[PDB]
Ligand SMILES: O=C(c1ccc(C(=O)N2CCC(N3CCCC3)CC2)c(Nc2ccccc2)c1)N1CCC(N2CCCC2)CC1
C-alpha cells in the first residue's frame with residue numbers, strides 16, 4: 343500500500359501541476375481496449391523509418407508491450423494505448439508506406455488477410471487508434487540535431503509525414519539516425535540557422551563541400567525546397583520546477599513506472615530522479631515525453647507504481 | 652553483511668570454476684597502480700576508432716572510472732586496471748596514432764607536456780600499462796555487433812599488438828570495433844557465399860552480383876588469409892553456475908549473478924533478487940564477468956541479491 347498525498351506531506355514537496363502535462367502524458371479519458379495477440383503495424387523505435395508487423399504481447403494499465411512477429415522478444419517495447427506511431431492492419435498499404443514483413447518473410451510474399459488466418463489471429467480494431475496545416479512537406483530540407491550525437495547539427499530532409507508529425511532523415515547517413523518530430527521541435531532549425539549562431543553545420547558524407555557548403559547549390563543539386571522559416575514554431579516553456587514530483591517510466595526496465603522527482607530543469611528537458619535509488623540512476627528526458635506523467639496516473643490507469651526504494 | 656559460501660549452500664548451487672575464466676577475468680597478479688587525477692590516452696568505447704585524452708576520475712578495486720577531458724561526466728566509463736585499450740601519455744605520437752584532444756582544443760594546438768603543466772596534473776606512469784595473421788588494410792566479412800543479422804564487407808584499419816580494429820567500408824566509424832583472431836564476429840572473404848548468407852556490400856558500391864576480386868583490385872587491398880581466423884573453444888559454463896558480473900546499466904556496480912542460459916560463446920547473466928527483464932546476453936570472455944570472490948580479493952564492493 344502506497345499513497346501520494348501522505349508522501350507529499352512526509353517529504354514536504356509539491357507535485358508538478360497536472361495542467362502542465364500535455365494530452366498524451368495526462369489522464370486518459372478512456373479504457374485500454376487492446377488485448378494480447380491482437381496484430382497491428384507500427385514504427386520500429388530504433389529504426390524510425392521502418393514500419394513493422396507487431397503483436398500485443400502484454401496489456402498493463404494504459405500501456406501495451408509490442409512484439410516484432412518472427413523476431414526475438416528482447417526487442418519488445420512499451421507505448422501508451424494512445425501512441426501515434428502504431429497503426430491498424432492495412433495502414434501502410436492505404437497510406438503508401440512500405441511495411442517490413444515478419445522475420446523470414448519476403449515483402450513480395452506477405453499478405454495480412456492470409457497471415458491473420460495462418461496465425462488464427464485478430465487485427466486490433468481500427469477504433470482502438472481513433473490537423474493544423476504545417477509548412478513542412480516531404481522532400482523539404484532543414485538543419486537538425488543528431489539526437490544520438492547532440493553536439494552535431496546536420497543537413498537533413500523531411501522523408502515521411504503522418505498528420506502533423508514528420509520523419510527527419512540525415513542525408514547520406516544511415517536511417518538508424520532518423521527520428522519523428524513536429525514544427526515546434528527544439529531539435530530542428532531552418533536552413534542557415536548554423537551560420538547565424540556561429541555553429542558548424544555537418545554536411546552530407548561524400549559531399550565534397552564540407553568547409554565551403556552552400557545551401558543554395560545543394561538545393562539545386564538535389565532539386566529540393568527548403569522548409570520555410572515560418573513553418574517553425576515556438577515551443578512554450580514546460581514550467582516544471584526543481585524538487586517537484588511526478589511518475590516516470592524506467593528507461594532501463596520500462597515495464598515499471600517509478601516515484602520520480604525533478605532533479606534539475608532545462609529549457610525543454612527535465613532530470614528524473616527515482617526516489618530511494620542513487621543519483622547515478624538519474625537521466626535527462628524531454629518534458630513533453632509520453633513517458634513522464636502526473637501524480638496518480640498509475641492509480642487511475644490501473645498500472646502498478648514502484649514506490650521509493 | 653553477505654557471503655558467497657552461505658549463499659552457495661542455501662541456494663544449493665556450485666560456482667563457475669576459477670579455471671574456466673580467462674587471464675583478464677580472473678584474480679590479478681598485481682594491485683591497482685592508478686590514482687585519481689593521473690592522465691592517459693585511451694580508445695573511446697562508443698567511437699572505437701578514436702583515441703582520447705583521459706583522466707582517472709575514480710579508483711575502485713582493480714577498476715578505474717575514466718573521464719573524457721572537457722566533455723560531460725555523463726560519458727565517463729569503467730575499465731579494469733589491466734585493460735588493453737588504455738595507453739600512457741605520448742603513445743599516440745610514438746605509434747603514429749591520431750589523438751583527439753580535450754573539448755574545444757584543436758589538434759594543431761594540443762601538447763601533453765604543456766597541457767599537464769596547465770592542469771597541474773601527472774601522466775599515468777608507463778609501468779602501469781606493461782600487461783595474429785591480420786595486417787592493416789586487409790579485407791574480411793564481419794558481423795555488425797549493433798545489428799547482428801548483418802555480415803558486411805570490412806577492413807582492418809588499425810592494429811595494436813594482437814588486437815585489431817574492424818571497420819565497415821563506407822559506413823560511419825561508430826560501427827567500428829576492436830577484436831582478436833579468435834572472434835566469432837569475423838570471417839574470411841567468401842564465408843557468406845559458402846554459408847548461403849547475404850553479404851552487405853559497401854554503401855554506394857554499384858553491385859549488390861558483388862565481386863570480392865574486383866573490389867580487392869579497385870581498393871588495391873589483400874583479403875585476410877582464411878588461416879589467420881582461429882578457432883575459439885567453448886566456454887564450458889553450465890546453467891545454474893554462479894559468478895560476479897558488472898551491471899551494464901550502472902557499471903559502478905558488480906553484482907551476484909547466475910548463468911541463466913548458455914550459448915556457444917555467450918552466457919545469459921541473471922542478477923539474483925532482480926526480475927528476468929534485467930537479464931542480458933554477454934560474451935563469455937568479457938572482462939566484466941569474474942569468478943566468485945574477485946570483488947573481495949581486489950577491494951571492489953559487491954552488490955548482494957535484491
Ligand atoms: O540501421 C540499419 C538497419 C538495421 C536493421 C534493419 C532491419 O533489418 N530491419 C528489420 C528488423 C527491424 N527490427 C525488428 C526487430 C528489431 C529490429 C529493424 C529494421 C534495417 N533495415 C532497413 C532497410 C531499409 C532501409 C532502412 C533500414 C536497417 N543499418 C545501418 C547500420 C548497418 N551496419 C553498419 C555497419 C555495417 C552495416 C546495417 C543496416
Ligand SMILES: O=C(c1ccc(C(=O)N2CCC(N3CCCC3)CC2)c(Nc2ccccc2)c1)N1CCC(N2CCCC2)CC1
Pocket residue numbers: 488491494496512515519544695698700701703719722726751823824825
Ligand atoms: O560517429 C560519429 C561521431 C560522433 C562523435 C564524434 C566526436 O565528436 N568525437 C569527439 C568526442 C568523442 N567522445 C568524447 C566524449 C564522448 C564522445 C567521440 C569522437 C565523431 N568524431 C569523429 C571524427 C572523425 C572520425 C571518427 C569520429 C564522430 N558520427 C556518425 C553519426 C553522425 N550523425 C548521423 C546523423 C547525422 C550525423 C555524427 C557523427
